[PDB]
């Protein structure tokens, strides 16, 4: 029973560490997606403003 | 007659009308010098740069200073040439603005001194050097893990307070002492109080006498901030071409040059591009960077600090800047607080020159072995923190023992650092660095204490320090 | 015939187009037929773009415009102290005329790089968090940035009030604020006696856009008069974002080409030109100084916008106020993680420099472990001590409205916190402990306070250790 | 091409097959020409008359009382953005759509058809039969549940799922792999002859998979396989 | 006189506008009094829009412009082998003039549907990974795509070097590259003896945008001269991203409305027109071939960007170089999962297939 | 409505309430009409004179010696984007906010004002 309890605690620790690493990787990819979206939004806004200015 | 006439004033943009058949060329400098005739006028002393030919004998220009007080009908004088700045020995130890007028209180340059235009085509293909060769800086970390190429561009990164200014001063001192060259500092968009602090730091370090400083403050119009880098580049080019020596060129921040160009383009009314930058971003960056090359006579190599907006390395300005870089130097606060200056990160720093075809087989092998040892030491950090030093195998203990000494040996005592510690400092050739690191890797000095390798220089000096410690 | 006289062609949205005015200067001040004033900004080939500095309802097409021949300027002098004026220098408090005898232009060159001296004199705001973690020196300009209702105006009022016993002159500029809030702020300053050395410049939201545009330049023009005389001036800008919006409106109505977020190309130049006039003059220039505290208002904590990025790049430091921290009860809600002062260290006295190092590390260590506090025991050897120390540190930095603290008392309380004398005091009693400790120091610790004031350094260690122990003997835990 | 097809549809009353290789290029060329004609740009730089022009082209491709035209059109999606105006406006003109995804292609699943984005008006109980409709709806439901479980699987793994969810994932993997097929045209790439599968065989195979008859086979045996018996043959050849 | 002589009205950012030139034709070359060449782009009712192919600082309003009577052309011939020239064909290495006799237009129609043949001949690059996994045939268009500093140039240099013993003519086009890198590339090509069959066309980053825009067309026009004589040509475009950026700059200087990522509408047509000229000719037309290896630089490995997707939809396959594999010492860092050759397989020899 | 309330504030010295059902529609109508007048567009299509018009409307609602006008204004936030320029310029004039929640109404609590979301200066 004591051996089983020790193994259970170690397994839970390892599983939580792996989950944290997976979450960090997901954040890493989401950051690149966010940067692309930000650049696209700025480009669209400035293009619309300039087109509206040129229409006059 | 070549006398213009102001017809439109809209902020920093001024339109000038000339006689038919006498328009100034693009990038020519125009002078406005008006003395007030009566109480309803203000004295004007302003310089303009030609940007476009609008037709009907009208020229659109951008001002290098404040346009307040201008009156339609004021006469404009065409100088017949772009902005010209003094060059030669007279510029050493002085501080200049974008127009080349001295800013310090030491007097003005005589009017008969030689002056060169700041606008110039890049050196021709046939005039470039055919071989790549290394610039020996005398700093062990740079000479070993991130070599500098003569004529190349190096990007400098790091947080505040890590020692970038001290590293710049040490580079200037070493180059001037050993290679006989000089340095030029270009403060693009620099804060005035920080510029004064930098000037005093150069003054009290004794290195001001071998460098020329050019400042463009943030309170200047966008046109002025765009052209200051060209002034510094022209001052460096004079020494490259006329005396055939190797010159350092430091740019405070090239991102501010990029944003000044964007602001100027927006003022001129061009349609923006990409994430809002000017359509001519790549062309302007290339025109600036292609003049920093190595020729048959001499070379100019540049150390540039780059700001990354919003931490996005895919932003157009950082991307077009990185397209030209040949090496990268990263400074880490952890090494600074650990006490190992110059605190250059041995793993984050990268260089294109670190290849066996350039630095040689033994240099490349030693550098790769050192990098592998540091990587293993970094990997072992969590294990040694948790499982304990005893749990590490014999190989792990040996690699930790070697890696600590290797890491401490990367530190060096700087000449300009004597004002902080009193230690004279040293200059280490690349061959000595390679030999010392190879000897350390072989275990020849495993018995010496680890703290004897700190701030040492050559490999004999660590033996002397160990003997002094007993 | 049209050398000094003009005729209006178009009127609308506070912008007028005039024919003639051949000899008018760029930025000159002009007068309309009905007495409303104007400023000439756009000098075109056949017309002049004039921005109207008042109610434009009375101006019609065909009206006559006369030029004054004077560049835009404001009155300066000691007579402005204790009075509320508009950006044109006209009093609005109703207390009568202002007896100024000289003027200087609103647009003037900044001091050169060789006219300045390194910042070395502290500016005591009276707030423990600012004076400890984000120090401000004389001649430095520091940005205060945050969302709506986070306490920026409270910080400005407190730091203005704290300058009573110091040879400091304060100028408060309100751009686009409600007139009721300005009236209440002026009443508070009068109540606390700060009006004896303070000048208030106001341009409310109902005022025309050019007044909001010109107010900060009037503020620096008024400050520079005292600056070049050898005195020290503090200038506070309540909103630069509203200045940027007003300037964008003026530029768009004049049909200048737009840039990002419709702002003009020279929007960065405007703020840089304004903020570079604050400096610490060298001894050859008289030794005067001017310090600036611009304010920027963000939307939902978005500091990635254009104007916030420009102002962050211009200034020497930032102070971030967090809405969630304010809601959580941490006030004045200064986020020490993001706040930074590039001049820090040189802008502190010796004792504060000695004591702030441990405080910074303790707060930094606590902030990262705060997310794990709710799960109880993680590592009772070190982490539990870190959590308690951080909680006590957070409790110490809290402060109430309109109660500035002298620097010596701040130094003493921070020393007591960092040396572990508060480790046994319960968290809920830290505020009362500090409040009673100040009274105890007033009653019995006069020698320590006098030594700190005279020498700017910590007293003998054993003396204040014994004083703190003696105070703790009397304190009762509730 | 449409005029040539219309002649056969109308004047001879014959059944016509019409293939258009990329109808997006027509809109792209219109966008290129539009700026020089003097028209002001639309939202993403397209022509203002995008919808009108595309409708005028598409409405002529129809079946009438005199003859029938069935048309298969490939539509390019720029930068994989399905919200782009040109792909978005052309959706309303189609009776059946097939949506290809780069993620499925990178997973090695060909023809990489998205099983949930693809729609057709013919999927009705009175057109294809009750059994076909039920099987298709059950397959779509299982795939939707598997898509929902993606975040949990990605972060916490398969260990925290319940017994019902584990079986859902188990069968969804097999269903997803079985939708792939080996083409006759693709033989030049891989050297595999390819297969032709009747509708009833497909329905029976998916019905058997949904019933758990093949839960014991490895999931790799379902790739590019054709009929359901070939799954058993591949599994046997793999050593199961 | 006036029908062949013009007068400049406006100058700015490499764009000029001229009055007169009544008989000028669309796409014709024009010459300024300064000696700088230009291209007639727009023929309006009262003025002609001219794109300046060189330094525009010497051109001022009121300068004279004269016709040349020739549509955009570059010199071609065997005398151009071993030389380094600009997109206009002017020698740059400084070894003297080029004694060519013939010229070819910049814009030419691509071979028709019935003028082509299926690719059946291997192109041996000498790289094990490419020759084994992603075979390239003569007449194929193969895209090389990757991030910054992933070995794209080294692959092309090795491929050019490997053609020494094969009847292949190589053309290297550098668009927007640093001059020092081009100098070193020329030096190593000379060292390995590749200059006996190589033509180098260069347009560095300091050059004005029109030259960068025109360089690939000059390269392909030079290649077509050998292609239509029955020979085999290999053309390398060192960066199509630089050309796309230069064309975007040129279009926005003309105030044309941009699309996504500020690129113009005809950005796809720009690359398609260039890449459709590489083909394997049928036996009736001599059996010559032209092989193209365009380069595209990605940002953070994003293959879904606009320009990469535009180029992928044109070529017959792509080779993907991965940054992390390159950093981990795997060189060349070819990603086998994303790399594919549509035309390949039929090009490989029987021994390599097995 | 404001000029009807101002009479009672000034001529009689009363304290009055002014209710505005959607203050966002004022700015929306201004933006709709600004384009046809020939004005250049602002950041996201609004009028360049947004802040000036909003301030000129709001600054007339003040407390004076004779009396006072206090205004309760219902605000619509499009797509719950508080960074939109019209809500951003409107919020700068508010002194307090009252938030109503359907959760409290379902529990039988009236007037169902959210105790934590509502804040006051
Ligand atoms: N090689 C060195 N030897 C000793 N001290 C050093 C060294 N390099 C840096 N320092 C220390 O670092 C500080 C100076 O840092 P420095 O001004 O060069 O950095 P920085 O990053 O350029 O700073 P800032 O951003 O404030 O301008 C001093 O405290 C100095 O003692
Ligand atoms: N230190 C403090 N302790 C307690 N309450 C505070 C403190 N500082 C500010 N407050 C309160 O916070 C509220 C908002 O403060 P303040 O007026 O300074 O905000 P602001 O950021 O200037 O916002 P705004 O000008 O947009 O209304 C007020 O009710 C004020 O009393
Ligand atoms: N197979 C290889 N083995 C060793 N080094 C290699 C190999 N291929 C390339 N390199 C080295 O990698 C570096 C970058 O390669 P290369 O310049 O060809 O890449 P690139 O993508 O064209 O770069 P850039 O964006 O700088 O033009 C060079 O130092 C080159 O020598
Ligand atoms: Mg420094
Ligand atoms: Mg406030
Ligand atoms: Mg390359």
Numbering used by the authors:
A (entry chain G): 229 to 284
B (entry chain E): 1 to 470
C (entry chain A): 24 to 501
D (entry chain F): 232 to 471
E (entry chain B): 24 to 377
F (entry chain D): 232 to 352
Q: Which of the paper's sentences describe this entry?
A:
F0F1 consists of a hydrophilic F1 domain responsible for ATP hydrolysis or synthesis and a hydrophobic F0 domain housing proton translocation across the membranes. ATP hydrolysis/synthesis in F1 is coupled to proton flow in F0 through the rotation of a common shaft. F0F1 from the thermophilic bacteria Geobacillus stearothermophilus is one of the best characterized ATP synthases because of its structural stability and simple subunit structure (α3β3γ1ε1δ1a1b2c10). The γε rotor in the F1 domain (α3β3γ1δ1ε1) is surrounded by a cylinder composed of three noncatalytic α and three catalytic β subunits arranged alternately.
In this study, we determined the cryo-EM structure of F0F1 exposed to 4 mM ATPγS, which is a slow hydrolyzable ATP analog, to prove the conformational change of the ε subunit in the complex. After focused 3D classification using a mask covering the F1 domain, we obtained the following two structures: F1 with the up form of ε subunit from 526,524 particles at 2.6 Å resolution and F1 with the down form of ε subunit from 39,991 particles at 3.3 Å resolution. In contrast, the structure of F0F1 with the extended ε-CT was similar to the ND-wt-F0F1 structure, except the nucleotide occupancy of “open in βE with ATPγS,” “closed in βTP with ADP,” and “open in βDP with ADP”. These results indicate that the extended ε-CT hampers the conformational change of the F1 domain from the inhibitory conformation with “open in βE,” “closed in βTP,” and “open in βDP” to the Walker structure with “open in βE,” “closed in βTP,” and “closed in βDP” during ATP hydrolysis. In another wt-F0F1 structure exposed to 4 mM ATPγS concentration, the ε-inhibited structure, which adopted “open in βE,” “closed in βTP,” and “open in βDP,” was maintained, although all nucleotide binding sites were occupied with ADP or ATPγS. This indicates that the inhibited wt-F0F1 structure by the extended ε subunit is not activated by ATP binding to βE or βDP, and that the conformational change of the ε subunit by ATP binding is crucial for the activation of wt-F0F1 for ATP hydrolysis activity.
